Amino acid sequence: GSHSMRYFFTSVSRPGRGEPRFIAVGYVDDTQFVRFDSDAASQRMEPRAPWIEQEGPEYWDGETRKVKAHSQTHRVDLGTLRGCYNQSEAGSHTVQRMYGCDVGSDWRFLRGYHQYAYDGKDYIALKEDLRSWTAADMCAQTTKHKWEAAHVAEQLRAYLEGTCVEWLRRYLENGKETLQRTDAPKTHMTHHAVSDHEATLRCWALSFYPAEITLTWQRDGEDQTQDTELVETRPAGDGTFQKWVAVVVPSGQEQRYTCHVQHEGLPKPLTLRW
Amino acid sequence: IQRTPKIQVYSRHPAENGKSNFLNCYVSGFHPSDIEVDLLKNGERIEKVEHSDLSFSKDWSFYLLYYTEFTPTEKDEYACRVNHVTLSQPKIVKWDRDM
Ligand code: MET
């Protein structure tokens, strides 16, 4: 199936004293593999998956250099944006940056992206062609002009289309035992009665990877969305994911309803019935 | 500009009395990132709680997993207590094994 490598960066200003809180994380697919936290004692990019531990000190030195450079760029940008929006020194503000690459099942480049937010709202993003910018407002437009004149897009595109994909291939190889493994959902159904006329059927999917999943209910073989509740997919904490979907039914009619589970780890979708 | 957290409290494994399980509180969809999350045993804060590295979703909202070991029993009540700038009062979500 398809894979992705993504880096996420958050900076939160600290008005009264010192530099922003800066947190960076990298992921392959739905697996975190590196982190940096400005508040942590190492001041190094740190491993978070066993397969990256392979990398030698030259890797760790390079990533540490790049991540600290990002933190400084955020620091500077927080100042610039404060000034552009005419904000005071009193308030904490946030910048967020995300970038990375998708590849298909052949591990060839599909798509790249590079996007930036201020105070949790879109600011500027590279368009899908990796050649132009989308700027949300006039501050961001000024930023667009500055990045156009400095040919930023060109540099990023070369990373996103090339370097990014090459790293992702490396890690998929080195981490193959988990990263190339699919863990099919382990499913069951539970039954709860509210009253003697209403029952809840809950269809559980546990211990699956990757996170993408579809849970759907049918009544007499027809899709039913009313009287259903789907919780957000959630991490188990062991690397796998959980989800459930529930339907309310008339007590005694439980046999009409079926739960349908789609996942990359299942060669055919599964059907569960009470 | 502020987005209130969504909260799920749950175990990593089917909840079995007597066996070392893991209690999770998953907070998501929130902005800004500053948040206070505690796991409670019979209303009292659990001290050894860890959390994931701060990340965020496509809509820029933040998510964190807070977690602690525990060997469940059938007397002990568990909950997750969250405070955030969007909340006038701390929100408590009780752990219910069936969710
Ligand atoms: C950890 S910051 C560097 C991220 C990524 N490896 C890059 O070269 O852009």
Residue numbers in the entry:
A (entry chain A): 1 to 274
B (entry chain B): 1 to 99
Paper text:
To determine in what region of the dsA2-binding groove the dipeptides bind, we folded dsA2 with dipeptide (GL or GM) as above and crystallized the complex with 2 mm free dipeptide present. High-resolution crystal structures were obtained for dsA2/GL (at 1.6 Å) and dsA2/GM (at 1.7 Å, see Table 1 and Supplementary Table 2 for further details). The structures show one dipeptide in the A pocket and in addition one glycerol molecule from the buffer in the F pocket. In the A pocket, peptide or dipeptide binding switches the Phe9-His70-Tyr99 triad into a locked state that affects the B and C pockets. MD simulations on the empty dsA2 indicate that indeed the His70-Tyr99 contact is largely disrupted, whereas with bound GM in the A pocket a locked state with a more-stable His70-Tyr99 contact is preserved.
